[PDB]
Design a protein around this ligand. Sequence first.
Ligand SMILES: O=C(NC1CCNCC1)c1n[nH]cc1NC(=O)c1c(Cl)cccc1Cl
Ligand SMILES: O=C(NC1CCNCC1)c1n[nH]cc1NC(=O)c1c(Cl)cccc1Cl
Ligand SMILES: [Cl-]
Ligand SMILES: [Cl-]
Ligand SMILES: [Cl-]
Lengths: 305, 305
Amino acid sequence: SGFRKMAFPSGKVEGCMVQVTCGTTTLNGLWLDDVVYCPRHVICTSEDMLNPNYEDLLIRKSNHNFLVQAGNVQLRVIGHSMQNCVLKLKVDTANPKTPKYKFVRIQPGQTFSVLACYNGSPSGVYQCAMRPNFTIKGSFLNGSCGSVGFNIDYDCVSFCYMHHMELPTGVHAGTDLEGNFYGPFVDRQTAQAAGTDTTITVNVLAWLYAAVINGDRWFLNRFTTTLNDFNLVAMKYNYEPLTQDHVDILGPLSAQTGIAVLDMCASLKELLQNGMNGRTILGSALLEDEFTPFDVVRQCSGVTF
Amino acid sequence: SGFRKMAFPSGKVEGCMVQVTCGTTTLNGLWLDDVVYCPRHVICTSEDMLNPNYEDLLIRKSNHNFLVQAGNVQLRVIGHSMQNCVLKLKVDTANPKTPKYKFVRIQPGQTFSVLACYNGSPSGVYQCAMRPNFTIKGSFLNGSCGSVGFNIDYDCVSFCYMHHMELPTGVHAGTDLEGNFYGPFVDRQTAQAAGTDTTITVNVLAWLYAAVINGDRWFLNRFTTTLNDFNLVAMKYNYEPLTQDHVDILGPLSAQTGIAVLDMCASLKELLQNGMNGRTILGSALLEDEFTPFDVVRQCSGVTF
Ligand SMILES: O=C(NC1CCNCC1)c1n[nH]cc1NC(=O)c1c(Cl)cccc1Cl
Ligand SMILES: O=C(NC1CCNCC1)c1n[nH]cc1NC(=O)c1c(Cl)cccc1Cl
Ligand SMILES: [Cl-]
Ligand SMILES: [Cl-]
Ligand SMILES: [Cl-]
């Protein structure tokens, strides 16, 4: 028993991280097969970031201007191209540690692990969720760009995020591995403010199921509700609307615990209206929303990789 | 910016995890050089755990009764011995992935990363602290015994914990890698209750420094205090006493932020007496105490491995 904010084992991704330097800018790249993926603003100086024309800045770059370093060994770049907001650097050596992998574009509310890196070296690993406003609340310092977010399915790494920028409010924005930003954000040092960071209702409900499974139950009440009535309450509290799709996804957790989904919604509704009254749930004094129903099933059953 | 509960990259330890089966009990072992470390209660059935005599149970075991499996490959056991509450299984093959490593016995309040494993396969990674009552609040299911806790220093893995047991209250107990339990706990399915789980004051202060560095500052007040006066308040709230050693350890964070240590203590004192008033600090509604001062410096500076 016990429930922790848990990231995937990072070894498979550690073996993919390299350093990319262009001029005086150094960040991280992802080395899969004979291609290194990195943010395209590696070609930018701090000056260029104010208003970059990436196509023009790229005319001035050749393969040999991209210094790729794997540990203590330099990689030979034999080609480069820009795809949306990432560069793909073709190298003459296939990464011998390439895992089985996929590129996936996740939806808001979905979770993933981040391997924070600096100069191509792994610094730490932590769990994140794509927020409803398409930011993530990560831990990134200057030099962490190119760090990736990922999920693992047994032996297949699904890369879903590459870090690119920090907004003035300290939240973070990035792309999928095809170089498309999540949300409306751009790799340009300008005014771009995040929208409302609503709470991921389906994840809160899954985490309440995790609590019940682990013995925290003071919050279970004598009530039930309906989707429409609950969402009226969820709206007032800046909670995402709960759909029947979400209800269906929570089915297995409902079956395991014998608590109907709408009953747990009624318990959540009271928690929102009454508050925690100084109590905690799984060691938290606020309702956690960065565990998916799949994360809960995974951690409560012992899935491995 | 941003501050996350962050574990070390786990790859170096993933390459050390094996499966150990004795009779019908399967758990995890740690393969370093030509030795596999695992909990000695691998020799026990669920029946033996009620009152085991490990020396007697071991008379009935031979090298070939310990099945060690690394991925899909069996390892040949050429010797075994019991050291305190761990078994050391000598194998004829040195682990080719052995990292630079040390065995360390940590103190309460110190933090480490856990690689939760099942059947020798990594399941997830998360960050823990040795609680003042010598339990840890982990995420362990049946089969996770032998999972280890560790810190990394650049390239040297310091193993400090091996998981052995779950107490009736759902907290967890284990040993260092020499097989000595942390605290008074024993590998025996009996009545052993944890003492008071006090809050790690020095870690809370470090985490408040982390918050200031990241822009959360509403809690900074106009007050200061003394060690003695603060500890009078800390006692009432089941906070560990703050020592001058702790003050010294917080020195660097004090210097970086220009906030004297006793001033931050005065801010903490008001938070304890007044509460959070529904506010949050670094996305938490309670005071976090599983970041050490070293963890904060590490994450805020970008140390890598
Ligand atoms: O999350 C899903 N699959 C996991 C991806 C990572 N590997 C494991 C499978 C998934 N598959 N179909 C729908 C979803 N997810 C959701 O509908 C969802 C949830 Cl559950 C929570 C928050 C937002 C969203 Cl969109
Ligand atoms: O934590 C320490 N070192 C780290 C070990 C892990 N690798 C990095 C170095 C350390 N070295 N000397 C004293 C300490 N720690 C403490 O005094 C302490 C703190 Cl700081 C917080 C809570 C409890 C305790 Cl005992
Ligand atoms: Cl452009
Ligand atoms: Cl004994
Ligand atoms: Cl909290």
